[PDB]
Amino acid sequence: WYNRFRVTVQSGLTLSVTQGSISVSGNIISFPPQTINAIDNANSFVWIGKTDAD
């Protein structure tokens, strides 16, 4: 429970998010460890969800 979706720096601007399961309207979606880049010279927010564009 404690390490679920923990966001840690991998290298450079690339950050590693651990595995974890989310519930969307009662449907369970499991995500493996993944990597995502931040935005340079900025305070970015790493979250899970859907955007208006996507």
Partner: peptide
């Protein structure tokens, strides 16, 4: 050899998520 066999045969969780999304 068992490790590489398991890596090849077993499905990625990302692939399974994409396929479940498709349906």
């Amino acid at each position: 050899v068992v490790l590489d066999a398991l890596s090849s045969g077993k499905a990625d969780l990302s692939y399974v998520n994409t396929q479940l999304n498709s349906k």
